[PDB]
Design a protein around this ligand. Structure first.
Ligand SMILES: Nc1ncnc2c1ncn2[C@@H]1O[C@H](COP(=O)(O)CP(=O)(O)OP(=O)(O)O)[C@@H](O)[C@H]1O
Ligand SMILES: Nc1ncnc2c1ncn2[C@@H]1O[C@H](COP(=O)(O)CP(=O)(O)OP(=O)(O)O)[C@@H](O)[C@H]1O
Ligand SMILES: Nc1ncnc2c1ncn2[C@@H]1O[C@H](COP(=O)(O)CP(=O)(O)OP(=O)(O)O)[C@@H](O)[C@H]1O
Ligand SMILES: Nc1ncnc2c1ncn2[C@@H]1O[C@H](COP(=O)(O)CP(=O)(O)OP(=O)(O)O)[C@@H](O)[C@H]1O
Ligand SMILES: [Mn+2]
Ligand SMILES: [Mn+2]
Ligand SMILES: [Mn+2]
Ligand SMILES: [Mn+2]
Ligand SMILES: [Zn+2]
Ligand SMILES: [Zn+2]
Lengths: 319, 107, 279, 319, 273, 98
């Protein structure tokens, strides 16, 4: 009996996911627990049909629905699927941005180990990457620029979401001919946002339109993941679903100044007895925390589930 | 040698569009009717949508999305695709072929 | 707006109404001797890379235009059809650089270009040394469409977008019209591989001769012989007839040999001298 | 699993499913063999049309029709379907009731494994849970009280069915305003049956009406699966269909005292040579059976097909 | 059953027949000054949380009620309609606690409450210390409807259901009627945003003034100027007029400025204290 | 809301249910505030103007109950035009042709 599993199953019992109105036209997909391969070609017509599947049939470690709309979302033949438009997506990953503290180690002896196995214990090595709130700050600056471009240059109404782990998703609901844009036409928008072929406007005014004012406000291109925007058939991590690498909620950011990166992003109440793998002092959900190897410690569920899914240790019981 | 031709007789497409079909309405829209209405007859981009929707709802059991038809029209326009030959239809999809032939026999 | 300068405004049907009714272009092309000769002149001028005369240097410009499209359709050479629409748009470019604003916006309205006048946009560059003004705006979705096949000068990241609209000056409005015409011509040639053509009108535009006695030795016996077939077909490949419409001409005969001849792909050389006249 | 198909296909050739009278208003759905995605939005007007589809086009591992009535059962959009009432459903799972014997193991090496995969063979672990007949007995007590509440308090006429695996389904045909009841109003009914907000009537008479007598007859709330009752739209497992986890018949229980949990619930005759994964002694359809790892064994088809679909081994041939 | 105590029994049309015909309430409301003022009294009493007088303390009881509904409809404050329908139902409660059974069953029959007398039900609790009797029964499907918006005390699991019927005493029959009335009042206000209202009768109920001289300089030239337009609309915003009906009074003009004035989103002769 | 009463009084053809679902029902209940049964009989009376076809009373009650419980507001002719053009064009022409 996986204990993280029960947490996830309990959240999905009552959680209300943000689902599109034409729900039956999307392909749903999920990565189950203890299986590295996705289940796809799922289709549901109501949030209740979906909730039954997640809670009784296949509990999701990661949950997605397609940015694209299909006539037959469950068909495996692509021409059967009948692609009929997709939403415009952007994904800002703090990969390129900050480069964080990372530690590879053996979960049995607790030593820093470069290799993929440990010689003594003959166990595979885990890696822990420390997600600081300064990283989320830099990420949050990027999506602020992106919302500026999409609103002022393109006239669109984007929605911002916490990715659940290391950044933000920007999604534009578009229902007209905007949804029918080529993958090629989306690469033109992607390169505009990234400032790839944008000329420097060396001596302009900050109030100039488009990239003229923006370049003279000191702003340059937005570091997005281009392949996310180019793929017409991308999988959107569902808002209010749980990110299987953190246990956090994919949360709408309705005001890009009120966003704080702390435990409130997790929906888990109570406390968990947590068993660390190493003696480490790191920042976890905006709070510096000291863990001691092999020394059980009672912490909140949010912090325990997070540290578990980040390979720092194991949640042993719930109170 | 000189440049060889291909074909020029597409009268049956107009007959199938005018009467209707039963089972293979979408495979006909995708591989024949759309490519013909835009890249052979060269009708308006929006008029083809209005014609293809009128054609599909003859048997009426089923539904086709306006968004899908615009998508197919844009895709055949950008790639210059030409409608399938009655022989190529015959090798690949006998279910569709026999449904078309019955509309051809019925006149 | 001068139809004499821009023939593609009027449809071919709307011009054939000047001549009573029922009389299609096939009729007027046999009466008139000048039309076919003028249409070949343009094609020959684009084959060597020379300028094309504006359609104002023609007494009936509309007819010269369509029979230039219909002649290109008959040759069925896309690599040349591309060259023509290219060259033909260059000719139409210069005419646009002499047209007033009121006329430029009407042509674009007829080419389905959704470009309009808007609140102009001024901004200074390089500490007010450079000035830049733009008084035409297109929505960015349309702009991405209109620049589908265009070079990097039109790439979206090099443009000025505000609230969803790309802003252009007059030289850019013209360059888009010039590209819209390069497309309208290629789009106007496809629906000319539609109707059948009285194959003398076909062979008139092709400038052909006749078919010699040895071939008409065959359209009579309806059973022929053996070597009377190997040469009847190896000739038919040299006319340029398709694989389908050939078996329909000689009915009530063997189709087993129709296969082995696709794999081939008085007078001396009887048929090939009386057909491919160097004229 | 190629042989299991033939068994099921043979049963559905002659079986007569209990189908509602307004058959053309129901959405049919089924899970085919070897496919994690459901086939749904089917509609049939006769038991013969359904028979052709199941035998020639798509053989069901699980077969359902909707508790809801629709104008367009085959429409994929929910509002297109035009819901016009749905039946009242209850589902009694003997999960919570009995607490059974469970074994997680690797089907290749045959060892007890805590994890979801096995180290050696690189295969995911299967789980076998032993379904005893005392378990079905406890389940039967719950539905007995449930029929009492529905008949005596609500005045309804419920039908009881063996779920085909681990419990019973109770279904009330109601066509008036009972069919139009909210999920909110259905949650009120669900909580009444479960005794959630029912006060203890400490010194009343056993012959008192409603929950007054019932609480003084020693009976408290019924352990149902509330989300099955709350959901306005649900898939009813068709009576007389086969449950793909056991091979048993979804069987009408006309008398709640005569129900015995044994091989008579399975329709499979003959014997099958069965190859166990582990050496185990368990109760199977009320009859204890002893299996030896990797040692083929001749047992009844009913017991073999059952043990197959319960992950204990593979049916290798039919006798 | 006293119409003077429960005005909502008789329809508005059946009351307008005492005064000839064709005369709707909009007409009769201009003659009387006391009616509109009495309706103002109730609204001001619900804004301050005071009891509401029973409608028998009025000379024209039916009319005072509808003009209180019509006043509430014109003010168009939903958060106030809530307080009123609450307070108004609270007032009607007391009148119910003085009514006989046949009258209580008559009111419920007129509110589409399917509540009846039936064979009573007695049972003892705590070894016959407590006794409980119920002589009214509702079908459980109707009961769930009538308790859609009610507290936990009305939750179905706390009731006594037998053979499909929930059993209530008289005090519970009353509590359902009182809630059925709190709903009928909100539902009776919606069909009063239907017809147009003579905008003096509106501004009488609204306690407004007139439109000043500075405004009527504009209703003449039909073309105006620039600052004559920026201010012409910023006035119309302060009355509370909708976005649609503004462009319809000044026809033949620019819609580009209709945008720039929505982005904004003499005055003393209107906001009279 | 004059057009809703005008469309309800005359009738429609193609989008009668999308009009009942998103406009007519929400208007008769959440703006006009009529009796629950008066809306059902009116929506049936409205639907059977083209007279070819059938709609179930159980579905209409379902639509009425759902907009009543959720306070749904009828679609604006602005929303009708952007999102469902087939429905819009049927409404606008019944308004132009009278
Ligand atoms: N396995 C997967 N396949 C396809 N798309 C995926 C995906 N996992 C995530 N996505 C989507 O693709 C974009 C980028 O994904 P990733 O950066 O790889 C994971 P994520 O959901 O963004 O969280 P993370 O980046 O904080 O770890 C997002 O819009 C996300 O919703
Ligand atoms: N959009 C599409 N384009 C091409 N083939 C399609 C298709 N949708 C389905 N098919 C193929 O057509 C067969 C039946 O699919 P269907 O869902 O019945 C569409 P259809 O028969 O073409 O039209 P219709 O049912 O709308 O009249 C299958 O073999 C499927 O692979
Ligand atoms: N895969 C599925 N998808 C949707 N609904 C399903 C389903 N399998 C079963 N159901 C329905 O959901 C309700 C409860 O089902 P479950 O408790 O999850 C399994 P079951 O069919 O009742 O058998 P079991 O509980 O004896 O194993 C029933 O109404 C059943 O018909
Ligand atoms: N209840 C409903 N709600 C929303 N859209 C519906 C619907 N029923 C049908 N549709 C829409 O209508 C189309 C197919 O149904 P139709 O045959 O047109 C029913 P309709 O137009 O709503 O009423 P009708 O009975 O007058 O034909 C699709 O575009 C579908 O989306
Ligand atoms: Mn990401
Ligand atoms: Mn089909
Ligand atoms: Mn069950
Ligand atoms: Mn319709
Ligand atoms: Zn180690
Ligand atoms: Zn193993």
């Amino acid at each position: 009996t996986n204990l993280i599993k029960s947490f996830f199953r309990n959240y999905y019992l009552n959680a209300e996911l943000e689902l599109p109105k034409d729900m039956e036209l999307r392909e749903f997909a999920l990565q189950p627990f203890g299986s590295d391969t996705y289940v796809r070609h799922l289709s549901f017509s109501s949030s209740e049909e979906l909730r039954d599947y997640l809670v009784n049939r296949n509990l999701p470690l990661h949950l997605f629905y397609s940015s694209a709309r299909y006539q037959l979302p469950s068909a495996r033949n692509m021409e059967e699927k009948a692609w009929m438009g997709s939403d415009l997506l952007f994904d800002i990953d703090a990969d390129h941005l900050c480069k964080l503290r990372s530690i590879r180690f053996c979960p049995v002896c607790g030593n820093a180990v470069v290799s993929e196995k440990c010689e003594r214990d003959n166990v595979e090595t885990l890696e822990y990457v420390e997600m600081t709130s300064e990283c989320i700050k830099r990420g949050l600056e990027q999506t602020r620029n992106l919302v500026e471009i999409l609103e002022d240059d393109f006239g669109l109404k984007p929605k911002v979401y916490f990715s659940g782990n290391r950044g933000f998703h920007v999604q534009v609901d578009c229902y007209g001919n905007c949804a029918l844009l080529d993958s090629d036409e989306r690469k033109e928008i992607a390169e505009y946002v990234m400032g790839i072929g944008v000329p420097g406007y060396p001596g302009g005014s900050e109030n100039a339109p488009g990239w003229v004012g923006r370049k003279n406000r000191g702003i340059n291109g937005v570091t997005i993941d281009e392949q996310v925007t180019i793929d017409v058939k991308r999988l959107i991590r569902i808002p209010n679903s749980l990110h299987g690498k953190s246990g956090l909620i994919v949360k709408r950011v309705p005001n890009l100044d009120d966003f704080e990166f702390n435990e409130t992003l997790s929906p888990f109440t109570g406390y968990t007895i947590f068993l660390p793998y190493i003696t480490i002092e790191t920042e976890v959900l905006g709070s510096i925390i000291k863990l001691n190897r092999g020394i059980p410690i009672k912490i909140k569920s949010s912090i325990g589930i997070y540290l578990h899914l980040r390979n720092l240790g194991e949640v042993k019981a719930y109170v | 040698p000189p440049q060889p031709k291909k074909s020029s007789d597409y009268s049956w497409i107009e007959k199938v569009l005018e009467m209707g079909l039963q089972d293979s309405r979408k495979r006909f829209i995708l591989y024949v009717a759309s490519r013909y209405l835009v890249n052979v007859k060269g009708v308006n981009e929006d008029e083809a949508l209005q014609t293809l929707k009128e054609f599909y709802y003859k048997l009426q059991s089923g539904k086709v999305y306006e968004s899908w038809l615009k998508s197919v029209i844009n895709g055949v326009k950008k790639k210059g695709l030409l409608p399938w030959s009655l022989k190529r239809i015959e090798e690949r999809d006998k279910e569709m072929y026999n449904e078309i032939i019955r509309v051809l026999k019925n006149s | 707006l001068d139809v004499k300068k821009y023939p593609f405004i009027k449809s071919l049907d709307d011009e054939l109404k000047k001549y009573g009714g029922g009389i299609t272009l096939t009729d007027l092309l046999l009466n008139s001797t000048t039309l076919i000769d003028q249409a070949k002149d343009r094609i020959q001028k684009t084959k060597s890379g020379d300028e094309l005369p504006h359609y104002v240097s023609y007494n009936e410009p509309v007819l010269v235009f369509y029979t230039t499209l219909l002649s290109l359709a008959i040759l069925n050479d896309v690599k040349l059809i591309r060259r023509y629409a290219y060259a033909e748009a260059k000719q139409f470019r210069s005419l646009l650089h002499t047209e007033n604003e009121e006329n430029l916006l009407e042509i674009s309205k007829l080419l389905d270009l959704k470009i309009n006048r808007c609140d102009p946009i001024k901004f200074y560059l390089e500490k007010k040394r450079r000035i830049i003004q733009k008084e035409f705006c297109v929505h960015f979705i349309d702009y991405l469409k209109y620049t589908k096949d265009l070079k990097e000068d039109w790439k979206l990241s090099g443009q000025i977008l505000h609230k969803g609209y790309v802003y252009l000056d007059k030289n850019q409005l013209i360059g888009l019209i010039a590209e819209s015409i390069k497309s309208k011509i290629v789009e106007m040639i496809r629906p000319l591989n539609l109707k059948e053509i009285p194959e003398k009108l076909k062979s008139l535009i092709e400038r052909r001769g006749i078919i010699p006695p040895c071939i008409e030795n065959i359209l009579a016996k309806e059973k022929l012989n053996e070597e009377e077939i190997r040469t009847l077909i190896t000739f038919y490949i040299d006319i340029g007839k398709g694989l389908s419409g050939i078996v329909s001409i000689m009915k009530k005969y063997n189709v087993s040999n129709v296969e082995d001849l696709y794999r081939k792909y008085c007078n001396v050389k009887n048929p090939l001298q009386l057909y491919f006249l160097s004229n």
